[PDB]
Write a protein that binds this ligand. Structure first.
Ligand SMILES: [Zn+2]
Ligand SMILES: [Zn+2]
Lengths: 265, 542, 355
C-alpha cells in the first residue's frame, strides 16, 4: 500500500487510525473519503494522497510534510514507512510493529508508545519521546531510534523502553520515571532534571546539575547486558559501552535512583 | 397551553398515587382536570409518570470543580456531536452535566459547596448549566469572621446577622458546613479532628460551631435544614462520629451529607465492618434527622471536597498519583482522583454499605439517594442503583462477582427486599424536594411546577431510567425518547433575605483590613450574568 | 465607532464584514481573550459555531503553571492567608517584588493562625541582594532559578551534605508553622514549578507549607476558569471536529501564525494587552477598547471599539488582590460591549448557514 503525496498541505492533518490494518479492511474507493483534516473545511485521504491499496500489512507514504500529525499512532500490526518529513506525535500509543521515517520528525514524537520500534533517520524535534500535556508518561515501552539529533527534553517523563539518539539537546531525561536512553554523542545542559529512575548514557555532556553526584568507575553486570543488547540490535551506541564509564546518581530532588554514564576520559 | 398526559401509571407518593391516570398542566403548572379540549395530548402506554427529579448533593460548580477538569482531562469521554447542542456532548463541561441530568428525568440539581468568597464564579458556573434549575448551599464554619464571633461569644443574635449577611450576599439557597473548624485547624497543623476536639486559636469545638449554625438556621427560617459534613470522613470509626453529631443537634433539624462514608464500623480494636444498621437505628430514634447516601460507583473518578483536613489525610491514596490541595480564605478545597477497584475489598464494601443504608430505611424520604458526585461516583449511575434496589435478582448477580468480604462484613446479601416505584419516587423527587423546602417540585398534585418525567416501562430498569421517554421543564418538553430537544437556561434558586445594614458596614471594615477589598468583590450582581435579573428566582423562608 | 477597509464607521456593517471574513477562512483563531467573562463566554461560544481555536495572551504563563499541575498537582494558598498566617515566606525570582504584596507581608506580622503575631522571616531566592525591605537573600545558582530549585529540594530531602548555602535555607524552611513559597510560573518555568511544587510536598512531611502561584495581569486565569466549565478543558481548545480538542502545542496562536496555518484571526482586547504584531500579516478582526491606542483602523482589517470594563462599562474581571472573578463597576462612565459584538457576529454567522 503506497500513498503518493500530491503536494503541499494547506492545514494540519491527523493521520490517526490510518494503519495498514485499517486500510486493508476498507474498500479502496471508500478509504479515499476518510477525512483526516483538522479544520472545518477538512481534507480527505484522496485530496492529500494518491491511494494505491493492496491487502498487506506494509504501508509506504511517498512524500512528507511537517504537517503530518499522529502518523503511525496506535499502530498494532505491520509497518509504515514515510519517505519524507513528518509532524508531531509519531506513533502516539503505538502498540507494536515498525515505523520508519526518512526525514525529520515533529515534537512529542513517540509519546505513549507501548511496543514496536520507531525509527527516525533524520532529526527529532523538541519533547521527542516526552509526555504530552497532562500525560502520565512519555515513552511507555516502544524503542525509539533517532539517527540524527534530538532537541530539548528528550525522554521527558519516560516510563519504559529505550531511546537510541545520535545527539541530544538540553534538559534530556527530565522527569524520567524509568527506562534507558543512550545518545552516542553530545548531550545538552542540565540533563536528568527531576529524574526518578532510569539509565542515561552519553558520549559528551554539558553542565551537570548540582544534585548529580559521581559514584566512580564501576564495572557493572547491567552494563555488559546493555552492551550486548545494543550489539544485537545493530546500534552505533554499542561502541560507547566498550570502555570504562563514569557514573552519576539520579537527581536528589526526587528519589535518587536514576543514573548517568559518561566515558572516563 | 393546556396539555393532557393520559394512560400512564402516575406515581406521586405525597398524595398516595400509584395508579394510571391523567395529568393536566396549564401555563407550566399542574392544574385540576379541565373539562375542555386540550391543545396537545401526550399518550403514555404504561410509561410510569413521575415528578421532576431533584438532586440535593452534587458537586456541579465551583473553583474546585474547575480544578478537577484541569487535573483530569481524561475523566469524561467527549463523543463527536454532529448536529448536537453546543458542548452537550463535550464530556465534563457544564452543558454535559446539564444535558445528562435531563436525560434521566431530573429537572433540579443543588450544589452543596457554594463558597462565600468565590460566589460569583460559582454562580456564573451554575448559570451556564442549561435546562435544569440549580441551587447553591453557602458554606460556613471555617472562616475567621464567624469563628471570631463564636470565640468572643457575641450571642445568637449577632451570629444570625452574619449568617444572614453571607446568605444574602452569596445568593445561596441554604447553609452548609464541611467539617466545622477542620480547615482552621489544618492550617494550624492539625491532621485529625473530632466533633468535640478543640480547634486552635479559637478554643472551640466543631459542635460549638455546628450548634451555633443550627441556632442561626432555625432562627432565620431556611426551608432546608443545616446540611452537615461530619468529622473523620472515610475513617474507620466514623459511625461513632456521625451518631454523636446527630445527638449533638439536640433535636434540631439537620441533614447529613453522603452518610455512606460514615457507616464504617470499627470491628477489632486493619479492617472495618458495616455500620448501616447502627446508623439506620439512630435515624429512626431521631425524627428530625435526614441524610443523603452517597453511593460508591466502581471505576475511575475524582473526589472534590472542601474538607481539606481529610483530603490531605488521604492524599497519598490518590490514583492517579497527583492531587491539588488549596487552603485559602475559608476552606479552599481539595481535589484528589480516586479509583474504586472493580473487585476491591475496600470498594466492594463501600458499595454494599450504600445500598444497605437504603434497604434498611423505614422511610426513603429521609434516606435520599445521591452518589456524592463525583466523590462516590458519577451521577449517570442513578438508573443502575434504582435497578439494583428495585430488582433483587440483579442485586445477587452483582454480589456473585464480589469477594466473600461483602457478606462477611455487611449483610447486604442477607437483606433481599425489593424497592417499589413509590419508594423510588421518595428517593429521587418527594424526599429531596421536601428537604430542600421546594414545595412546588417534588410532587405532581395540582399546584406543582410542571416538571414531569415519563419512563417507558422495562424489566431492565437501567435502560428504563437511563433514557426517559419524555421530560418536561415548566410545561415545555426538553428531552424526548432520551434525546435532548430543547436548549434554554433555567433559574438559580436563592433564598430571599435582607442583609442587616448595621452588619454590612461592620463586615466592610473587616474585609478591608483582611483582604484589601470591599464587599463588591464578594457580591453577586445580576449584570455579570447572561440573563440580567432573569437568572435568579426568589424562595420564601418558612 | 468601527473601521472596515478604509475607515467604515458603521458598527453593524463591521459585524457583517467580520462575519464574512471568518466564514471564508478554513483555520480561524481567537487570540487575545483579555476582557470580561461575558466576552470570554461569547468568544468561546463563537469558536464552537465557527470551528476555531483560541489562545489567550497569557498563554505562556498560564500553561507554565497548568503544565506542572495537570501532571504533578499543587499545594497552594491565597494572598490574604499568606499575609494573615505565614510566618516564613520564600520569594523565588524577581517578578513577585513588583507588586505591593511583598511590602504588605513585611509591614505587618501575621494576624491569624497558630503563628499569628510572631516574628516574620523573609527569605529570597534570585531576588535583589539589597532592598528597601529587610530580608535574607540567597544567591541563585549559575544555571538559573530552575537549577536552584532542584538544588534546594536536595537539601530538604536530606540527600546533600551540610554547611552549604541552601542547607541553611532548608533548615529555616522546615522550622516553620505556615510556609508559603511565592513564585511566578512564567519566569520559573514548567519544570521549575513541578520541582517547586514537589519541594512543598517534601516540606509538608513536617510542617504545613503552601505555594502562592502568581497570577497573570491579562485575565488569563479567568479564561482558564471559564473555559474549564464551558468546554470541559483548559484554554487553547479547537472546535474543528465539533468537540473541544485540547492541544497546548497545536492551538498555540503564536505557533499557528508563524507556521502559516491560520488564515484569519480575531483579537479580543477590551483591556490593555501587548499588541501581537502579526495583525497586519493576516486578515484580523480587532475588538478593542475605546481608550486604547489600537482603536485606529490601520491595526486590523476590521476594528470595533468596545467598552473598557472597570472604566467605561461594567464587567466581571479577575481580581488581583482577591484571587477570584469579581464584578467591577464602571468608574464614572449607548456604548457597545465585547460580549455584544461577539454574540452579534455569531448570530450573523448562524444566519448565513441557514440560507
Ligand atoms: Zn463538599
Ligand atoms: Zn463532601
Amino acid at each position: 500500500s503506497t500513498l503518493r503525496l500530491r503536494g503541499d498541505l494547506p492545514e494540519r492533518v491527523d493521520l490517526l487510525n490510518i494503519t495498514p490494518l485499517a486500510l486493508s479492511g476498507l474498500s479502496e474507493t471508500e478509504a479515499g473519503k476518510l477525512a483526516i483534516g483538522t479544520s472545518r473545511r477538512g481534507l480527505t485521504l484522496g485530496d492529500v494522497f494518491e491511494i494505491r491499496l493492496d491487502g498487506s500489512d506494509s504501508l509506504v507514504i511517498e512524500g512528507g510534510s511537517a504537517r503530518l500529525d499522529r502518523v503511525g499512532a496506535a499502530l498494532s500490526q505491520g509497518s509504515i514507512r514515510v519517505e519524507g518529513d513528518v509532524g508531531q506525535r509519531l506513533g502516539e500509543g503505538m502498540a507494536a510493529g515498525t515505523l520508519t521515517v526518512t526525514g525529520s520528525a515533529g515534537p512529542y514524537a513517540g509519546t505513549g508508545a507501548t511496543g514496536g520500534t520507531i525509527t527516525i533517520e533524520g532529526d527529532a524535534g523538541d519533547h521527542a519521546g516526552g509526555a504530552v500535556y497532562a500525560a502520565k508518561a512519555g515513552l511507555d515501552g516502544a524503542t525509539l531510534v533517532i539517527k540524527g539529533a534530538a532537541g530539548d527534553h528528550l525522554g521527558d517523563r519516560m516510563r519504559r523502553g529505550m531511546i537510541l539518539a545520535g545527539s541530544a539537546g538540553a534538559f534530556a531525561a527530565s522527569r524520567m520515571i524509568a527506562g534507558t536512553i543512550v545518545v552516542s554523542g553530545a548531550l545538552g545542559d542540565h540533563p536528568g532534571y527531576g529524574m526518578r529512575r532510569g539509565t542515561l548514557i552519553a558520549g559528551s555532556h554539558g553542565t551537570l546539575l548540582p544534585t548529580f553526584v559521581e559514584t566512580g568507575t564501576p564495572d557493572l553486570v547491567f552494563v555488559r547486558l546493555l552492551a550486548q543488547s545494543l550489539k544485537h540490535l545493530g546500534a552505533a551506541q554499542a561502541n560507547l559501552l566498550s570502555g570504562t564509564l563514569r557514573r552519576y546518581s539520579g537527581d536528589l530532588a526526587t528519589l535518587g535512583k536514576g543514573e548517568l554514564f559518561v566515558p572516563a576520559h | 397551553m393546556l396539555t393532557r398526559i393520559h394512560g400512564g401509571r402516575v406515581v406521586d407518593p405525597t398524595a398516595g398515587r400509584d395508579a394510571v391516570g391523567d395529568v393536566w398542566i396549564e401555563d407550566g403548572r399542574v392544574v385540576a382536570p379541565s373539562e375542555r379540549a386540550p391543545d396537545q395530548t401526550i399518550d403514555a402506554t404504561g410509561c410510569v409518570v413521575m415528578a421532576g427529579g431533584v438532586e440535593v448533593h452534587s458537586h456541579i460548580a465551583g473553583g474546585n470543580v474547575v480544578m478537577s477538569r484541569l487535573l483530569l482531562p481524561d475523566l469524561y469521554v467527549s463523543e463527536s456531536a454532529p448536529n448536537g447542542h453546543p458542548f452537550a456532548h463535550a464530556g465534563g463541561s457544564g452543558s454535559w452535566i446539564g444535558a445528562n441530568y435531563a436525560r434521566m428525568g431530573y429537572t433540579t440539581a443543588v450544589e452543596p459547596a457554594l463558597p462565600p468568597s468565590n460566589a460569583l464564579a460559582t454562580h456564573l458556573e451554575l448559570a451556564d448549566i442549561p435546562l435544569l434549575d440549580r441551587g447553591g448551599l453557602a458554606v460556613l464554619g471555617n472562616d475567621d469572621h464567624l469563628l471570631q464571633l463564636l470565640r468572643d461569644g457575641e450571642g445568637k443574635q449577632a451570629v444570625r446577622d452574619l449568617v444572614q449577611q453571607t446568605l444574602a450576599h452569596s445568593r445561596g439557597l441554604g447553609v452548609k458546613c464541611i467539617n466545622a473548624g477542620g480547615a482552621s485547624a489544618f492550617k494550624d497543623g492539625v491532621l485529625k479532628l473530632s466533633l468535640d476536639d478543640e480547634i486552635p486559636c479559637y478554643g472551640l469545638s466543631t459542635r460549638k460551631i455546628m450548634s451555633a449554625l443550627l441556632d442561626a438556621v432555625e432562627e432565620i427560617g431556611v426551608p432546608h435544614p443545616l446540611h452537615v459534613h461530619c468529622n473523620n470522613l472515610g475513617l474507620p470509626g466514623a459511625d461513632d462520629s456521625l451518631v454523636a453529631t446527630l445527638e449533638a443537634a439536640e433535636g434540631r433539624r439537620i441533614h447529613f451529607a453522603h452518610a455512606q462514608f460514615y457507616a464504617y464500623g470499627v470491628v477489632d480494636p486493619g479492617g472495618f465492618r458495616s455500620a448501616a444498621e447502627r446508623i439506620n437505628a439512630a435515624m429512626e430514634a431521631h425524627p428530625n434527622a435526614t441524610y443523603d447516601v452517597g453511593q460508591v460507583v466502581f471505576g475511575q473518578t475524582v473526589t472534590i471536597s472542601l474538607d481539606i483536613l481529610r483530603q490531605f489525610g488521604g492524599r497519598k491514596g490518590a490514583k492517579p498519583k497527583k492531587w491539588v490541595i488549596s487552603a485559602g480564605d475559608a476552606e479552599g478545597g481539595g481535589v484528589v482522583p480516586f479509583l474504586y477497584r472493580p473487585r476491591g475489598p475496600v470498594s466492594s464494601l463501600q458499595w454494599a454499605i450504600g445500598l444497605e443504608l437504603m434497604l434498611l430505611s423505614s422511610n426513603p424520604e429521609r434516606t435520599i439517594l445521591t452518589t456524592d458526585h463525583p466523590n462516590g461516583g458519577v451521577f449517570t449511575e442513578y438508573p443502575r442503583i434504582i435497578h439494583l434496589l428495585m430488582d433483587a435478582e440483579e442485586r445477587a448477580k452483582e454480589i456473585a462477582t464480589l469477594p466473600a468480604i461483602v457478606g462477611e462484613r455487611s449483610g447486604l446479601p442477607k437483606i433481599e427486599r425489593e424497592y417499589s416505584f413509590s419508594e423510588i419516587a421518595q428517593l429521587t423527587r418527594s424526599g429531596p424536594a421536601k428537604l430542600l423546602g421546594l414545595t412546588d417540585r417534588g410532587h405532581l398534585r395540582e399546584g406543582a411546577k410542571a416538571d414531569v418525567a415519563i419512563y417507558r416501562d422495562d424489566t431492565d430498569r437501567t435502560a428504563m431510567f437511563s433514557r426517559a421517554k419524555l421530560v418536561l421543564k415548566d410545561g415545555q418538553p426538553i428531552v424526548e425518547d432520551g434525546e435532548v430537544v430543547a436548549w434554554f437556561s433555567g433559574k438559580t434558586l436563592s433564598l430571599n433575605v435582607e442583609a442587616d445594614a448595621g452588619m454590612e458596614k461592620r463586615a466592610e471594615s473587616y474585609l478591608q483590613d483582611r483582604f484589601g477589598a470591599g464587599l463588591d468583590t464578594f457580591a453577586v450582581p445580576d449584570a455579570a450574568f447572561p440573563e440580567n435579573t432573569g437568572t435568579f428566582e426568589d424562595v420564601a423562608c418558612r | 465607532a468601527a473601521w472596515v477597509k478604509g475607515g467604515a464607521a458603521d458598527v453593524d456593517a463591521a459585524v457583517e464584514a467580520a462575519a464574512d471574513l471568518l466564514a471564508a477562512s478554513r483555520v480561524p483563531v481567537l487570540a487575545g481573550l483579555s476582557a470580561e467573562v461575558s466576552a470570554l463566554r461569547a468568544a468561546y461560544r463563537l469558536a464552537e459555531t465557527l470551528g476555531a481555536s483560541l489562545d489567550p495572551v497569557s498563554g505562556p504563563s498560564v500553561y507554565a503553571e497548568l503544565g506542572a499541575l495537570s501532571a504533578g498537582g499543587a499545594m497552594s494558598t491565597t494572598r490574604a492567608e499568606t499575609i494573615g498566617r505565614a510566618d516564613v515566606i520564600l520569594i523565588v525570582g524577581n517578578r513577585p517584588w513588583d507588586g505591593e504584596l511583598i511590602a504588605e507581608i513585611a509591614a505587618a506580622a501575621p494576624s491569624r493562625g497558630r503563628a499569628a503575631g510572631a516574628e516574620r522571616a523573609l527569605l529570597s531566592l534570585g531576588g535583589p541582594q539589597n532592598g528597601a525591605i529587610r530580608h535574607v537573600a540567597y544567591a541563585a545558582d549559575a544555571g538559573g532559578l530552575t537549577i536552584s530549585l532542584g538544588h534546594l529540594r536536595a537539601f530538604a530531602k536530606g540527600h546533600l551534605a551540610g554547611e552549604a548555602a541552601f542547607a541553611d535555607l532548608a533548615k529555616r524552611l522546615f522550622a516553620a508553622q505556615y510556609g508559603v513559597i511565592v513564585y511566578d510560573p512564567e519566569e520559573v518555568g514548567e519544570l521549575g514549578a513541578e520541582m517547586l511544587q514537589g519541594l512543598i510536598r517534601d516540606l509538608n512531611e513536617s510542617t504545613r507549607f503552601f505555594a502562592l502561584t502568581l497570577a497573570d495581569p491579562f485575565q488569563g486565569r479567568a479564561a482558564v476558569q471559564l473555559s474549564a466549565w464551558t468546554t470541559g478543558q483548559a484554554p487553547r481548545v479547537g472546535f474543528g471536529r465539533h468537540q473541544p480538542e485540547h492541544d497546548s502545542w497545536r492551538f498555540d496562536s503564536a505557533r499557528q501564525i508563524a507556521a502559516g496555518e491560520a488564515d484569519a484571526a480575531l483579537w479580543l482586547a477590551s483591556l490593555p494587552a501587548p499588541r501581537p504584531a502579526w495583525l497586519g500579516s493576516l486578515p484580523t478582526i480587532a475588538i478593542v477598547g475605546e481608550g486604547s491606542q489600537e482603536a485606529a483602523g490601520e491595526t486590523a482589517e476590521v476594528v470595533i471599539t468596545v467598552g473598557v470594563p472597570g472604566q467605561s462599562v461594567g464587567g466581571a474581571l479577575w481580581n488581583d488582590r482577591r484571587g477570584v472573578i469579581a464584578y467591577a463597576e464602571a468608574s464614572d462612565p449607548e456604548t457597545e460591549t465585547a460580549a455584544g459584538v461577539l454574540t452579534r457576529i455569531r448570530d450573523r454567522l448562524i444566519e448565513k448557514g441557514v440560507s
